[PDB]
Design a protein around this nucleic acid. Structure first.
Length: 158
RNA sequence: AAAUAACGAAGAGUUUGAUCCUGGCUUAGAACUAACGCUGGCAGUGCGUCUUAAGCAUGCAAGUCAAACGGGAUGUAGCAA
């Protein structure tokens, strides 16, 4: 189903040697099924196209299931990676993905449709994506939490 | 799987040979009793000395009561009253 692929970053880096300085390309990439599966990948190469391909291949291995809810997330989460804090909050329908660059990329790849978000702290795009994925770790699902708390979905409110 | 509530929060450039973090500066927006530059058809509504509480030609902006009173003047009746 036409896996969405969004190129977050294509940075050009270098290391110096006795001869001079040698250049290289790093590509940070997010792929997603669009229906609950999403993953990210990092690639490095001597040229942009090979770096892009490597990042794609790496991303296709870190696919993980995130339980979406009718096109949004069950509850407000805060993802803290190293210094990138990302607050994500589900919203009433038809609001639209109110998110920055990397957050919007990962969200449309995931399939979410209607959230608000804010990127506090560092704006390093790669760290922001990783913080978003930590928030994905923090998100829950109703049946399991109810099965581990010894309740049932109706009883969980009464 | 679900229920209810929420009717609303977007980033980016820039320290380095390159990187992360800290950090300031700058930037896309909405405004004003605005001014200036180029250009300029109309209508409706609203607004129009933010500075010298500086000096001011001119005209107007607080008068009315004759059924409160004694008189003057005028016209008529009146010889005069």
């Amino acid at each position: 189903r036409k896996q969405i692929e969004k190129l977050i970053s294509l940075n050009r880096v270098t290391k110096v040697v006795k001869g001079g300085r040698r250049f290289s390309f790093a590509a940070f990439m997010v792929v997603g099924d669009g229906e609950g599966h999403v993953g990210w990948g990092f690639g490095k190469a001597n040229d942009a196209s090979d770096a892009i391909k490597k990042s794609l291949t790496s991303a296709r291995k870190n696919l993980r299931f995130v339980p979406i809810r009718k096109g949004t997330l069950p509850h407000e989460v805060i993802g803290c990676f190293k210094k990138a804090k990302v607050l994500i909050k589900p919203a009433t329908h038809g609001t639209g993905v109110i998110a920055g660059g990397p957050v919007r990329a990962v969200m449309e790849a995931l399939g979410v449709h209607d959230i608000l978000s804010k990127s506090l702290g560092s704006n390093n795009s790669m760290n922001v994506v990783k913080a978003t994925f930590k928030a994905f770790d923090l998100v829950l699902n109703a049946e399991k939490v109810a099965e581990m708390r010894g309740k049932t979905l109706k009883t969980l409110w009464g």
